[PDB]
Amino acid sequence: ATFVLKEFDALKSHFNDTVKIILQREKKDKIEDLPNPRKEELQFLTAVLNQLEAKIDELKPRSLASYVHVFYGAMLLVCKDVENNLRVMEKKENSLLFTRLMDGMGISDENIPTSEQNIMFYRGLNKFLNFIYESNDSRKGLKKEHFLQVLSLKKIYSLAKLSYEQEEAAENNALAKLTADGKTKANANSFHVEKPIDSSIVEQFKSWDEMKGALHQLILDELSDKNVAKISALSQARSAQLKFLQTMAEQLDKIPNQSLEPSEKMAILAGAMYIVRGQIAQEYGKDPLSNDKISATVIHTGLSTILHANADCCEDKEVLIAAANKFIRHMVIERPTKESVRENNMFSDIAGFQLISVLTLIQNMIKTCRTDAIEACVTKRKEELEALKP
Known part of the structure; x- marks a missing residue:
């Protein structure tokens, strides 16, 4: 019962x-x-x-x-x-x-x-x-x-x-x-979106190829700043974050375009960038969606730049983060009776990766975008009402 x-x-x-x-x-x-x-x-x-x-x-x-x-x-x-x-x-x-x-x-x-x-x-x-x-x-x-x-x-x-x-x-x-005992293998080619993302939201990222090139250049920057040759030579937290971005981009790049349009790949990668950006902000005690400049994380500053995060509205952020949420869940959560995390998934070889923490962080960022939106809307209406008093 x-x-x-x-x-x-x-x-x-x-x-x-x-x-x-x-x-x-x-x-x-x-x-x-x-x-x-x-x-x-x-x-x-x-x-x-x-x-x-x-x-x-x-x-x-x-x-x-x-x-x-x-x-x-x-x-x-x-x-x-x-x-x-x-x-x-x-x-x-x-x-x-x-x-x-x-x-x-x-x-x-x-x-x-x-x-x-x-x-x-x-x-x-x-x-x-x-x-x-x-x-x-x-x-x-x-x-x-x-x-x-x-x-x-x-x-x-x-x-x-x-x-x-x-x-x-x-x-x-x-x-x-959730338990992590799902035995099924994930199928990236069975992933389809319900509604096409508004291409005006991803237009800021120019194209799928240029977005991969900006990510590639940013990683080189972090290697050059830390004076090391490979991602595995960075601190584990930053190493796993960059490995997570590279893994998302490599996995999306394999999906045929007729199955997942390049604009949708751009949206998923942008959402993944918001996740890493948010994880780094939390290391400095800031909200994941903080717009504070952080004095010297090459990666946090660089992701803020690629994303135009300081200039984008909270509704756009929510769309991009929700896009990544949907793709990630398709790949790691098997469903029918119960949902479970797949034993073998696209993140299994990222040492120290915390998948449940990532999915929980997504929920926090979505909540914050929604709260920011209603705050902005009632604040504007208050202002309009005060301007029309006698």
Whole structure:
């Protein structure tokens, strides 16, 4: 027996009862007369529910499973927000909202959602939240009228940031549970992308051949700076990072173009460069996506240069890192019942390589890109609203 999800109308009718219970107990007529945080928590959930029903009417889905996933994600996000907003010696078990929401989802001490369900909830909610951006594209900012506009800008930011963090944690937990006993061999030629990458995102890298040449020159630079002749003669951390980049480029170069276009190879290699850049930044105590100049890592400075990392937007970074994530997982994670890491994979001969650490770092960078995007968007909207006061 595994956890069974409540269905959509069961969640909806239980949630609406929850609102009625809270309003009667507070002697209020409507949600907007409640005090915060409960006010905004219930406005968030009501707004999510209303947008879900509007999308059911527009898209006419065969089944509501994806809508159930978003609503679970949103309710669990509020439950986490309730915990985070608890004062003194307040206990979540005495929160009417926390206990009602958990009851509505069917969650108790002995019955909790699976790892796979938790990932689907937050992955689904995070995709859903993009409906607040013009064309669902945070590069364009918030819509002038969006489905969360009842909320303060600060609360939109804090809830989205929390949700990106919950997905990161759920994916990290799944990564931590993997065993490395997969017996299958990987097939690089069976890897295909779902959507073609916007070639304007990789245009900065000129071409597949020039990108390999920039990487080759950068490695020569690090050899020349350290006055050694081979990558294996560098410190192990830097040695394994450069070996990882060379291994990614060699593996992509073998894939026939009709199977994987050169623009997609450029995207995967750029994402791999963001990974190495991020690992080096962490050695210096900086965020992986730091834009700080680091006084003298030839490699970190050089990757920043090849990537135009200081000039590229966070959405572009996320696309490139997500591209590398997809290719790496195709090559190292076998799937059906359980996923596992392949015993023999394209990184097996890199001494000291930490594959789970790399996949966990990817989750961190994706989270940061998403958080940077919503921060930028609510900050711009705040600025626009202040400029239109009397």
